[PDB]
Design a protein around this ligand. Structure first.
Ligand SMILES: [Mg+2]
Ligand SMILES: [Mg+2]
Ligand SMILES: [Mg+2]
Ligand SMILES: [Mg+2]
Ligand SMILES: [Mg+2]
Ligand SMILES: [Mg+2]
Ligand SMILES: [Mg+2]
Ligand SMILES: [Mg+2]
Ligand SMILES: [Mg+2]
Ligand SMILES: [Mg+2]
Ligand SMILES: [Mg+2]
Ligand SMILES: [Mg+2]
Ligand SMILES: [Mg+2]
Ligand SMILES: [Mg+2]
Ligand SMILES: [Mg+2]
Ligand SMILES: [Mg+2]
Ligand SMILES: [Mg+2]
Ligand SMILES: [Mg+2]
Ligand SMILES: [Mg+2]
Ligand SMILES: [Mg+2]
Ligand SMILES: [Mg+2]
Ligand SMILES: [Mg+2]
Ligand SMILES: [Mg+2]
Ligand SMILES: [Mg+2]
Ligand SMILES: [Mg+2]
Ligand SMILES: [Mg+2]
Ligand SMILES: [Mg+2]
Ligand SMILES: [Mg+2]
Ligand SMILES: [Mg+2]
Ligand SMILES: [Mg+2]
Ligand SMILES: [Mg+2]
Ligand SMILES: [Mg+2]
Ligand SMILES: [Mg+2]
Ligand SMILES: [Mg+2]
Ligand SMILES: [Mg+2]
Ligand SMILES: [Mg+2]
Ligand SMILES: [Mg+2]
Ligand SMILES: [Mg+2]
Ligand SMILES: [Mg+2]
Ligand SMILES: [Mg+2]
Ligand SMILES: [Mg+2]
Ligand SMILES: [Mg+2]
Ligand SMILES: [Mg+2]
Ligand SMILES: [Mg+2]
Ligand SMILES: [Mg+2]
Ligand SMILES: [Mg+2]
Ligand SMILES: [Mg+2]
Ligand SMILES: [Mg+2]
Ligand SMILES: [Mg+2]
Ligand SMILES: [Mg+2]
Ligand SMILES: [Mg+2]
Ligand SMILES: [Mg+2]
Ligand SMILES: [Mg+2]
Ligand SMILES: [Mg+2]
Ligand SMILES: [Zn+2]
Lengths: 59, 205, 137, 118, 9, 122
RNA sequence: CGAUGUCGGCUCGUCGCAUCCUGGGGCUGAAGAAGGUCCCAAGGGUUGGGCUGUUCGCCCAUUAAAGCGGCACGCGAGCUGGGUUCAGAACGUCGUGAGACAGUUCGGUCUCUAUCCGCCACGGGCGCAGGAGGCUUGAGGGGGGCUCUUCCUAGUACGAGAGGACCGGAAGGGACGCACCUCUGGUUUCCCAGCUGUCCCUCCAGGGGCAUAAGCUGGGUAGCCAUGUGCGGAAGGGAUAACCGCUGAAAGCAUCUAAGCGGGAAGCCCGCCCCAAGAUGAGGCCUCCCACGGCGUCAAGCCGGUAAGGACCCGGGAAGACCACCCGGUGGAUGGGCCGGGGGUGUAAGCGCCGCGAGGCGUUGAGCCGACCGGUCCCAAUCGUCCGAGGUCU
RNA sequence: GAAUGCCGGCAUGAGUAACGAUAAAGAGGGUGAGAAUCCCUCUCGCCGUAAGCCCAAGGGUUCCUACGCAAUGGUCGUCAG
RNA sequence: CGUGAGGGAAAGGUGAAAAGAACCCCGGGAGGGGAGUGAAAUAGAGCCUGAAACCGUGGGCUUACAAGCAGUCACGGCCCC
């Protein structure tokens, strides 16, 4: 409701052209050593836990 | 024209003939020439120099061990010297004697996204009186309907610093070969630790 | 490379070791080399030491005297070759590092605020008499 | 710029930040494991490690210093008696951070584990 | 709104 | 460092007690005046019946300063006041005898009679 | 006129030359110095104040000089709002009056969000027809370009005297520009200490919260900085401007020109610095990886696990808005802890001794101690996953 | 097909500005299909001539409690006015 | 909406008949997939017919050295009859 304001409705081709980078990237995961589940690396596997400092395992 | 690579160690003041300072210690360690570019093959004249050793096999396969001097390929093989063809093997540091004038090229410290008036020394606004939110702004950036655009070099804000800077005609105060040390007169760019190269000056020689 | 400072510490072979230990608050006379036209005469500056900013070599300290109704401060490199010598004239109780405050009371309040450092005084002499008793052979 | 500087500004002013660190330690000295976000967890190491190394040395002065950051006269007891001797032959690193795999919903915060080591 | 401001500037 | 608008102390017996800097004479546009530079100044306060009266646009050399001056030997020196000696267009002091210390910078710039007359050169 | 905000100031500039200075030159009623005038020349530079809303101008102190104009009397989706330019009010003046005056006076709401172009920065994609890691060439751009003073020559030339050259050489400067933190000097937000009020932990002692978003004060490493430090303008090569000539006709002589040939500017081209192969005209060099297991039995390809390698992810970084960039990722010192050294505070607590007491002294430069230089696998960079050539035609 | 037309519908700017005081949060344990946001405990901060109590005006079911989350809550919501 | 006088909306249609979808399955629900009712289930109840702007998914052609009142006229290639 004030100073600078869009001159011309941005066309469909141009709106969609700026969303050419709006794409999401899939989460990056790896097989879990013990259980066969998938886990984002460097995270404590919820199911199994680390060798040493406690898993706090679902057990 | 003799050149060599190095790191910036640090700065200190020195005393000679009562007058004191100032110096930037830079170790210009041994550079083993890894390649020697020639007008018959490359069409110009230079020498790849290769710097700090290390690399317990982080070296890929192109490596270029080739020239039997690749004594565990260096980290910074970066940069030749151009119109330089040394003793064929290992550019020591004794190439510069004290009294000589030199040119250090380094990479300036990076200020990141910097406003005009740091980027460019602009005057900004009044700190008071009329004020209104422009205390550090660039003022006007042009004319009106003609030319009706902004010039193609207009000094504005942006990523200032973190770039190639060469300061010339630096004096060599002393060289210490036992430790591959080289000394000059302050003006040298880059942070401590940075790669810098050192040439003899374009002033003459 | 891993010695970035030990490297710097190496050029600093200009280090001086003859000069006396001293800390701010105590007054010291520093014999200084001066040119004075072509020649070279040894001028003395005698005042209260008022600040020591240490940085290894290229540490500086500053001394302060009132001369001919005007205050003067001089700033010396602790390892300046020009320092002929430097010798303490009285040991004063500091109670603070940088004591710039005395710039604003150069009078009677300047003493009694910087009183005698008995403990450091009674070393300085008794600490010498033993060094006088040694090497009399 | 703000180059070679150290310590996370955690979007808190000086006294709040200090309080935060100081509270988290209390919590982490009490339960021995804590869940917080990663940067909060990456900052607790230094702080809790130093208090522990202080209980190690043992002297009454060392107590009174730790007591400045912990205020609880017990718990500091627990520190000096039960917690401390467990690390006597360990020089540093009395603490561990492990990044959890689930993120806070409607916030999005990467969480992390922080527990006393051993 | 309804004005009521007079045309100043 | 002295610039136009700065009160200086008068360190000679020319009569004036204080001058205010009008301009610094180094180049077309020198920002500051240090020991041994020549300044132009208005007189703002005087002693009755002396050689110079209030209002007298004079020239003078700077002899002491609050900001420290650095010696190329790595030492420095600063004084509690800013002080000048009023001089004539031959750069000679229009007064006999000068009060309080002056920097050696004075000697190096050729102001021999000042440093002689001075109680102490530091 | 269903709105092109109208003076001046600030800011940021850039352009023209009919140039204020600096460079070069002709004439001079040019001895010399200093001027006068005209030609060539814009590369760069062209100060700070008092007055006034002022532009302008007058003054003060300087200077190499204090240039003039264009860009909507450049620049209000950049700022200001003194002026002008609403409503209030008053003076003088005009009108019987309400009111009026480029006459005056005091006062008087300047609008957070940039879509396209343009600009300053940074990336994502594809391309460069085999895929890689590096190191490069520089087509073509940008930056920069200023000047004073003193000395030597010599106080000779010149000049009655007074003054006082050129050419050549040297040293200091003034602004400006790039970089830097050793020194000087700043900040440093919890690094240390001192202090007040108050509430609390437990009475003492000792400490903690709050008194900004530091309670106040005294200091202060790194880092970031200018006042501080170091460099820069050039040298030099080439072609010219005005201008000065050589040889030389037409026109026997003479003429710098009509054939030629030289000299000759802070200007021009190149050298100095920075960008730069999207320079689809996609460049060069060095070193890596190589056959297709199967479909299109034909043209270009397709599905596919692999190769050199490269991402993902994680520890980080004087790199940084995100991105990028860079260094690491345990056959590892990347960060965190710990230790050692710097460095800052200024001699903690506890105990003993002296004092009725506030305190003082000793244990003691103690204790505490961010960023800096290092050491040390104590904690965390575990485990892995996914991409990626198999080369058109003469 | 136009009237800065009228009513309605859906776009654009845009995943942009914003989310209403800079008094401030951390953790453990519960409950739940689902918790930064609900209950509980501990620690921290803020008001205290109030940001605490009691009336008057006005408001008119907002009070208490049980069961609930489509919407109202500038997010969430097992909570709630 | 407004103190008040006064101003003043929007909003109709399953099917002939609810025969309004038992039951199973995912889900906390919502809402779907089956099963079933009906001639018709894009007649399923924010229900007849379901237009356009607008927003999606899939396929064909086309596009990263290119200058644009976006069309038109020629040739050309690819795709479908
Ligand atoms: Mg940076
Ligand atoms: Mg300012
Ligand atoms: Mg302001
Ligand atoms: Mg405008
Ligand atoms: Mg940082
Ligand atoms: Mg506070
Ligand atoms: Mg109009
Ligand atoms: Mg219009
Ligand atoms: Mg001209
Ligand atoms: Mg002339
Ligand atoms: Mg005034
Ligand atoms: Mg005025
Ligand atoms: Mg005008
Ligand atoms: Mg102009
Ligand atoms: Mg005009
Ligand atoms: Mg205008
Ligand atoms: Mg405006
Ligand atoms: Mg506009
Ligand atoms: Mg006004
Ligand atoms: Mg009348
Ligand atoms: Mg008017
Ligand atoms: Mg009028
Ligand atoms: Mg007023
Ligand atoms: Mg605005
Ligand atoms: Mg446009
Ligand atoms: Mg500093
Ligand atoms: Mg207190
Ligand atoms: Mg007490
Ligand atoms: Mg507060
Ligand atoms: Mg300080
Ligand atoms: Mg290429
Ligand atoms: Mg490390
Ligand atoms: Mg003690
Ligand atoms: Mg230490
Ligand atoms: Mg080791
Ligand atoms: Mg019509
Ligand atoms: Mg409209
Ligand atoms: Mg509408
Ligand atoms: Mg936007
Ligand atoms: Mg934004
Ligand atoms: Mg926002
Ligand atoms: Mg709020
Ligand atoms: Mg529930
Ligand atoms: Mg309070
Ligand atoms: Mg109700
Ligand atoms: Mg209730
Ligand atoms: Mg909600
Ligand atoms: Mg709300
Ligand atoms: Mg309930
Ligand atoms: Mg169903
Ligand atoms: Mg139907
Ligand atoms: Mg029908
Ligand atoms: Mg229908
Ligand atoms: Mg094409
Ligand atoms: Zn597992």
């Amino acid at each position: 409701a004030k100073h600078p304001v869009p001159k011309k409705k941005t066309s469909k081709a141009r709106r969609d052209a700026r969303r050419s980078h709006h794409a999401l990237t899939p989460p990056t995961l790896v097989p879990c050593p013990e259980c066969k589940a998938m886990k984002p690396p460097h995270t404590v596997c919820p199911e199994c836990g680390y060798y040493a400092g406690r898993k706090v395992l679902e057990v | 024209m003799k050149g060599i690579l190095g790191v910036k160690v640090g700065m200190t003041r020195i005393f000679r003939d009562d007058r004191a300072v100032p110096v930037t210690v830079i170790l210009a360690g041994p550079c083993p020439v890894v390649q020697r570019r020639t007008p018959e093959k490359d069409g110009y004249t230079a020498v790849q120099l290769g710097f700090l050793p290390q690399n317990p096999k982080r070296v890929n396969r192109p490596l270029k061990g080739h020239f039997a001097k690749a004594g565990v390929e260096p980290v910074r093989i970066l940069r030749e010297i151009r119109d330089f063809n040394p003793e064929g093997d290992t550019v020591t540091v004794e190439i510069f004697k004290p009294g000589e004038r030199v040119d250090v090229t380094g990479t300036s410290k990076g200020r990141g996204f910097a406003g005009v008036m740091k980027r460019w020394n602009f005057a900004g606004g009044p700190d008071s009186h009329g004020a209104h939110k422009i205390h550090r702004h660039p003022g006007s950036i042009g004319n009106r309907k003609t030319p009706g655009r902004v010039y193609k070099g207009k000094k504005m804000a942006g990523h200032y610093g973190a770039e190639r800077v060469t300061v010339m005609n630096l004096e060599v105060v002393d060289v210490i070969p036992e430790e591959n040390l080289l000394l000059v007169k302050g003006a040298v760019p880059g942070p401590n630790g940075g790669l810098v190269i050192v040439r003899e000056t374009k002033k003459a020689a | 490379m891993n010695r970035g400072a030990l490297i710097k510490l190496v050029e600093s072979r200009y280090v001086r070791t003859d000069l006396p230990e001293f800390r701010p608050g105590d007054t010291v006379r520093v014999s200084y080399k001066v040119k004075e036209g072509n020649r070279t005469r040894i001028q003395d500056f005698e005042g209260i030491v008022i600040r020591i900013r240490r940085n290894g070599f290229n540490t500086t300290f500053t001394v302060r005297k009132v001369s001919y109704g005007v205050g003067v401060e001089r700033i010396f490199p602790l390892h300046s070759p020009l320092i002929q010598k430097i010798d303490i004239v009285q040991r004063g109780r500091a109670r603070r590092a940088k004591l710039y405050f005395i710039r604003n009371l150069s009078d009677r309040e300047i003493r009694r605020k910087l009183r005698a450092d008995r403990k450091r005084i009674d070393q300085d002499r008794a600490a010498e008499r033993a060094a006088k008793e040694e090497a009399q052979k | 710029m703000r180059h070679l500087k150290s310590g996370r500004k955690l979007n808190r002013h000086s006294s709040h930040r200090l309080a935060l660190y100081r509270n988290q330690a209390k919590s982490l000295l009490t339960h021995g494991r804590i869940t917080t976000t990663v940067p909060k967890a990456k900052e607790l190491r230094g702080f809790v490690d130093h208090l522990i190394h202080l209980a190690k040395r043992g002297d009454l002065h060392a107590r009174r210093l730790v007591l400045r950051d912990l205020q609880d006269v017990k718990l500091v007891r627990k520190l000096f008696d039960e917690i401390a001797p467990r690390y006597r032959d360990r020089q540093g690193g009395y603490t561990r951070v492990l990044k959890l795999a689930e993120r806070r919903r409607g916030d999005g915060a990467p969480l992390a584990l922080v527990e006393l080591v051993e | 709104x309804g004005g009521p401001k007079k045309k100043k500037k | 460092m002295i610039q136009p608008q700065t009160y200086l102390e008068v360190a000679d017996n020319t009569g004036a007690r204080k001058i205010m800097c009008i301009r610094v004479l180094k180049g077309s546009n020198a920002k500051y005046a240090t020991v041994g530079d020549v300044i132009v100044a208005s007189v703002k306060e005087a002693i009755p019946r002396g050689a110079v009266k209030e209002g007298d646009v004079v020239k003078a050399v700077v002899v002491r300063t609050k900001k420290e001056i650095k010696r190329p030997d790595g030492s420095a020196i600063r004084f509690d006041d800013n002080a000048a000696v009023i001089i004539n267009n031959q750069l000679e002091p229009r007064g006999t005898r000068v009060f309080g210390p002056v920097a050696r910078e004075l000697r190096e710039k050729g102001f021999m009679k000042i440093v002689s007359l001075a109680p102490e050169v530091l």
